[PDB]
Design a protein around this ligand. Sequence first.
Ligand SMILES: Nc1ncnc2c1ncn2[C@@H]1O[C@H](COP(=O)(O)OP(=O)(O)O)[C@@H](O)[C@H]1O
Ligand SMILES: Nc1ncnc2c1ncn2[C@@H]1O[C@H](COP(=O)(O)OP(=O)(O)O)[C@@H](O)[C@H]1O
Ligand SMILES: O=P(O)(O)OC[C@H]1O[C@@H]2OP(=O)(O)O[C@@H]2[C@@H]1O
Ligand SMILES: O=P(O)(O)OC[C@H]1O[C@@H]2OP(=O)(O)O[C@@H]2[C@@H]1O
Ligand SMILES: [Mg+2]
Ligand SMILES: [Mg+2]
Ligand SMILES: [Zn+2]
Ligand SMILES: [Zn+2]
Ligand SMILES: [Zn+2]
Ligand SMILES: [Zn+2]
Lengths: 278, 278, 353, 353, 253, 253
Amino acid sequence: ANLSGYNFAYLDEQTKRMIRRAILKAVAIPGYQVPFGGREMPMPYGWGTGGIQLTASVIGESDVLKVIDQGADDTTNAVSIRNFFKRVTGVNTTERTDDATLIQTRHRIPETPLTEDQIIIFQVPIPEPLRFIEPRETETRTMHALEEYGVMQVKLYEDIARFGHIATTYAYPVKVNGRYVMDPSPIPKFDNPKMDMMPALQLFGAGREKRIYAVPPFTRVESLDFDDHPFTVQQWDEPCAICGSTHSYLDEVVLDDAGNRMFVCSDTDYCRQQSEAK
Amino acid sequence: ANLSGYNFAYLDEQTKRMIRRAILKAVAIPGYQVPFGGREMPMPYGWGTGGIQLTASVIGESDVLKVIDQGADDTTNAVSIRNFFKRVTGVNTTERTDDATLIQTRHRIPETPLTEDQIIIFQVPIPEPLRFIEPRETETRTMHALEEYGVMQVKLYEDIARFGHIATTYAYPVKVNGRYVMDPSPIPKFDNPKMDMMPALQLFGAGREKRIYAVPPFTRVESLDFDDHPFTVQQWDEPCAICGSTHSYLDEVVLDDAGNRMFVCSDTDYCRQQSEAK
Amino acid sequence: MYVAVKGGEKAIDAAHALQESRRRGDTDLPELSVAQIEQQLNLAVDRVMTEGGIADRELAALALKQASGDNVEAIFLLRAYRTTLAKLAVSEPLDTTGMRLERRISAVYKDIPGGQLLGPTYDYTHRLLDFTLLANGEAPTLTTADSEQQPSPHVFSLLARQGLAKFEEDSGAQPDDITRTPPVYPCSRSSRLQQLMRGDEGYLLALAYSTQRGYGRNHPFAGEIRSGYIDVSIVPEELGFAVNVGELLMTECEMVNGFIDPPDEPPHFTRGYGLVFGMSERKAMAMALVDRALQAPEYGEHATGPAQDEEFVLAHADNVEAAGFVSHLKLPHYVDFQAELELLKRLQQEKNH
Amino acid sequence: MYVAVKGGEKAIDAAHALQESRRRGDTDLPELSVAQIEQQLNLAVDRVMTEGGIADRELAALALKQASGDNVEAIFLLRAYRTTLAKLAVSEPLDTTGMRLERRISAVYKDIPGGQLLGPTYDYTHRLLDFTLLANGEAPTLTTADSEQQPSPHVFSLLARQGLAKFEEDSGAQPDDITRTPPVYPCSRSSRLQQLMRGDEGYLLALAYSTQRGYGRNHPFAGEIRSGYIDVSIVPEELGFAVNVGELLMTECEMVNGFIDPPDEPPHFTRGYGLVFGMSERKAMAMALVDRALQAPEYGEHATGPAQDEEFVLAHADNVEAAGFVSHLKLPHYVDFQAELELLKRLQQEKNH
Amino acid sequence: QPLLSVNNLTHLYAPGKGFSDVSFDLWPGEVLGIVGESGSGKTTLLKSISARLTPQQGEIHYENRSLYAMSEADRRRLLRTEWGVVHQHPLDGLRRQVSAGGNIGERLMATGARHYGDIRATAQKWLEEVEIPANRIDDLPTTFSGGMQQRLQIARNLVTHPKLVFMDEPTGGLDVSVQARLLDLLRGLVVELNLAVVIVTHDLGVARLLADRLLVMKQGQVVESGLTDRVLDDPHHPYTQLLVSSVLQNENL
Amino acid sequence: QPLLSVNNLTHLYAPGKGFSDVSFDLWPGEVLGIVGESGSGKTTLLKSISARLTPQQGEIHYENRSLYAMSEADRRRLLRTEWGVVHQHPLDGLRRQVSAGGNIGERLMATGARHYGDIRATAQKWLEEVEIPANRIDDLPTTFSGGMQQRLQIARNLVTHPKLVFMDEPTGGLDVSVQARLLDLLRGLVVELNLAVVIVTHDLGVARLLADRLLVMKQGQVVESGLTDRVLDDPHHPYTQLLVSSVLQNENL
Ligand SMILES: Nc1ncnc2c1ncn2[C@@H]1O[C@H](COP(=O)(O)OP(=O)(O)O)[C@@H](O)[C@H]1O
Ligand SMILES: Nc1ncnc2c1ncn2[C@@H]1O[C@H](COP(=O)(O)OP(=O)(O)O)[C@@H](O)[C@H]1O
Ligand SMILES: O=P(O)(O)OC[C@H]1O[C@@H]2OP(=O)(O)O[C@@H]2[C@@H]1O
Ligand SMILES: O=P(O)(O)OC[C@H]1O[C@@H]2OP(=O)(O)O[C@@H]2[C@@H]1O
Ligand SMILES: [Mg+2]
Ligand SMILES: [Mg+2]
Ligand SMILES: [Zn+2]
Ligand SMILES: [Zn+2]
Ligand SMILES: [Zn+2]
Ligand SMILES: [Zn+2]
């Protein structure tokens, strides 16, 4: 339970309510960056404050919280955030995706498909998919308002002309509900397909940049691409060195100074499930 | 004498010699900003470090040092600099212009005409007269090299077109030896005439900006102006409230909250001389 | 074969223990007290209060102690602590004319009503390292003058009465609160000043310095700098009349800027404003300079420096955000970097084909 | 009639005495020791050493004590003290591969040879004000692991061996020394790095942050951050062979930056470098980010942010210069302001004619 | 019904700078040339009727919809997919840091094109249409000559086959041969695709060969209008007579 | 002896971009026309011969002094007081934040003028010379139309009565009436003051009425040169024939 001297989930009720109104607006306007009066957390800005605030505003006593970073529950920041939530809520926690009611993640969508009533909360550094093309909010806001997305299409076409490929490899922009160009957070392109027509509700929090957006269940999410340069996901020549999976995003572990390396699933829960199956 | 544990004049001999070579080059190239490897002083950058370094590199045991700020010897920074020099050199000091062999000043040239063998050392924040027109050194250096002074003339003409007068009132640019446009330090326009064909050597130090320049004795110094908008000096409707002088730069002393004020000479030594004459 | 193991929690705990031990340092030395930091490192405390958002000297000193003197970490600690507290009141507007002066200076006139009161300052000191501080010493026995505080009207009031400057009038506009609503560019001057007060001291100092060097010049003169105690009053709903809850040590800076010649009024000086907790002044001066720079849209000024670029200045001013996001690169980024590596390897293979 | 009187010297002396008394604070509290500041406020000391130019922890702590915790004033004190000392030697180039590691992390790979060594860090702490520090406490009894330091090759070496990055080669070029010759823009990378190491932490942090937000993006990943003890060696003329004069605690940051595709070589990651005294890292990270940003002319990059504007960044980076020039406005400016006033009064009279 | 209808349109920066009380219609497959004194308000009018400058008075109706009563989103959608705008300064209509191929392909992708190869092929074909070598596709416009930039802008604004193109002095910086190529291209587009054009020009030969009607502008006022040949050969207003008399006469050998 | 002498001048950004092996003379009181295909190297050549682009090969002699063997200071002094340069884009030859009066008066003050009233009067007189109202003197060029900016640039570069003026398409953005005014002004300056002009133009009428000789440039090479009338009426090179045939013929009523 909550026995730390702080309000449940550490946010005062006013902040929770403001964030909840923001969440509802975001759901009603898929892909649109809803500004919200976010607060400074015990974690520094840029270390997951937006996801922390979203989880604190949605989480209840019966929720089973899963926190992952780089697809792993044992990552330093995942451990920190999960311990904070255990302190200020007392909720049950799990590393198993299929048992989680709330999944707060940084840069991965779990390999295990999500299910109805699950909520996955993404930590987002840059909520504006046009930011690296247009650094100014004064311009990107108008571009989203008027659906003026040409600079993005020009960026993609110039990337193809220069390198023969789209240069963006993670946070790959996606069109949501046929209207809004949205940043999917720093997930690798491997995970973007999972966002399309998913039974779980997706929430996205950028605490430093003060934005919340959402993709409701069963919403179209299509990565920007070309017919002759179709969206392609990361591939590796090796399977997971532990579970042998060929269908998972792999992380490269450098073993020695002589160039010896191995590749292992970024999704440690999926890796454990695969290893137990065999 | 010097009994403080520091080298005479606080600078090591290498720094004095480098500054002395810079001074000689500046003299040979009137108006040209000579870069020099200036050092951090006990006074913050922007509080007279360049003048301090120049005086330390030129001063000797038999010199009679006069230090003034706003024309007054008793000004806070003047007292500080003079006390520092008394500590690290032990030289005789004076408030009388005609008895000084070295005069270090901030924003005034004394009303008392200077004489042969006197050196007046100006503290300069911005040694580049084109800086407020062109903030970049990469451009102003070339403009001085190629004698490309049009932006300054355009600034003056645009000032006349806008306000009917040249907007600059202190640090008024001057052409030196018919060639170099030079910043005279933030002395008022009132003092610029005194620089023309003066028997004393004028040195200018910008420690923060790392420049030294010079006007040798008996060198032409002409303020940039127009025939129909000739160089005009500051004027006041009142004489000095103390000595009654009408020929001195006046400072405005606010006496009460009801708008009562008086005007008194900025040159306190000149004011004392005038008051003693009457 | 390789098996995953749990190392995150214990490594984190060990790292935090190491940091706490380093903070304590040599146990032969007595542990620093928060009172000592508050009293003897008071300028660091001033900065931590101003940028953390809470004017509580003890809390700022506590944050500094906890942060091992890291001003950025202490500022973040105080700022985060702010989130846990309830807003019990909103003060009546401060009235700096009622300040009990520790220091009052003006660069624009040699002497002014109320005089040049240097107060406690390092100005005009010779910055020579004082090695006598390596051992205990005796503080100077202060000399004393008359105890009366002479009337010290604001210099800008004397400027405005002459018509040289414009009085800052209050139309009753409701201030914007960037702590409750995220900033919307272009921001009102109230929002800009709130953000500047919370901004990084070094960043704003560098911006103001660039303005002094021609990158968006505003021709500034230090019209007045005051440092002293100002009373804080509230109007509680319980009682319905104003109550004085105490006083705060604050520094206020009013800068004269470049005059303007508007079409239908006499030409007059522009102005900038800075306000900070404590005695440290340069933050207030830089705040006034950058406030004037960001006033460019009001005056139709053609920007010549980044200090006039509102979004660039304000979006990167808060060192909580900037330090957090720069430090976040320390976080594991190997998924992303693997996505980058895959692309780069394919590009190299294609080029070498 | 009015007669001038002498007030400057006595007012200055009184002001300095007031500042010294404020620095001492309440005499009931024991006076802070420089050793205490060195040990327990070690991150402030790290910043003061890095920006003051002298890696002497005791001197930095002394400056902090003398500056009442004002990091800017302490930095200036140390920098000024540098001028009074003779250069007895020039070190042989540092070899960071020989560092005795207190901390070593890499964001680009989950695990690396030598491991992720978090060391003493505030990273992953919950920034909740620790009120137990208001009273004396007991530092944690540190747990212990194996004492051997595993081989920790630089991550960039592993990148370059794969061809993903370019080794930083030494052609024997003589470094520029901005302490002996004023900078000449455009500056060499050696001069730029020397200036960045001396630069204001907050200014450079804000610039790096702006680069992360699209104002001159460089796609950075924290390839490696190390903090530890590195030996310093010299070659005295008396003996003619190298002697180890001791070791310094230093932090080194290597950033992997956005890859490039040069016309006649495989595409590869760019890189940035940061190096500071002590444990404080964010200065090193910001230094690497801004170093990469200022590498734009080498890579023919079209500037999209002020962080890429070499003169704007470097000319205003040194907080000694910036703080000094911003503070100088406190100096009397009444002669210049009188000139300004005369012009403005004439303009008003002419307009009102 | 007119494709574009302008009634009592006015926009004045000051008393005489801009245009005042301008009315005209335009239909598909028609060219409205605009000629007159430099500084007469032609560029201002072209901006106003192209949804780039809100008029102080009057109304603009496009397909029977008031132009400035629409949402900003609708106006930008028109300017992206429906309209073409050729600026007096070519770089104002180009992306400086985007290749010529990208400058052309932005418009195609705005119309739903999503095949990179087809977009590039169309861009090369249109570069050859305006006599820009197809091997300049990946070069930035900053490396182009003034006339090359002008032709790139024209190709960019014609690639989507818009229903209405506003052009400000499109022949500026063009040699007579490539000018003739451009005139033939525009005439063919107008006759075949029913394209409508509003062209500001100072070359009365281009106006005569291209414009179906003319507007003569002096000091912000349309002083004469009607059939192009009638205006040029039978001018009634003194300024139009002066303008036609100032034409540089040529001789036949 | 020729005022300007160009021998084997070459500057190529790439194999075909720019100009190669260009030689010609110019004397006082003469006008060298430069015509040719857009992108043929005319602006590049004009920059090179006007001390703005160092050639890779060849020599330029001004009054028997090698142009690029001189110091940079001497070249800038020539461009300040001796020469005039009219850019293809007018704003490139103007100070955006400086009024028209200041833009003109900069050149006068560069020649030693130091009377504000006389400078302003001369600026107004030259504004009226190019048919810009004298009440626009204090307006910034950003508020000027393209043709107004062009004429301001011309006035700025002619006010000092230079011995040599390089012009890149100076008639761009000008109506035919003000174009005729400008042609008369330039012809008068050339005949009276012995001004020499190198004018790049795409209007063959202006070249015929103004240029004494012509150079025809194709792909960076002078393919034909000689007396203007001979080149235009008796072209030998195929490209020159194509160019003259592309001229828009007019009719006399
Ligand atoms: N931004 C502006 N501010 C003030 N006046 C302007 C502005 N833009 C154009 N003008 C003036 O409006 C008039 C019309 O300009 P324009 O329509 O560009 O002429 P043109 O028909 O030659 O293109 C000109 O006299 C010009 O000086
Ligand atoms: N900076 C540059 N880089 C590369 N090519 C250029 C550059 N500037 C011009 N060019 C090329 O050189 C050729 C000559 O250009 P220019 O002399 O401007 O032609 P014009 O005769 O039409 O003025 C053109 O084909 C152009 O694309
Ligand atoms: O602004 P916040 O506090 O909500 O942090 C959001 C994200 O910003 C950082 O960048 P990242 O994507 O690498 O991961 C970090 C973090 O998850
Ligand atoms: O750079 P430094 O240290 O040599 O200081 C030169 C000048 O810079 C400041 O500006 P100021 O003219 O008001 O007076 C001060 C000082 O005299
Ligand atoms: Mg026009
Ligand atoms: Mg050209
Ligand atoms: Zn696996
Ligand atoms: Zn007097
Ligand atoms: Zn990140
Ligand atoms: Zn000053």
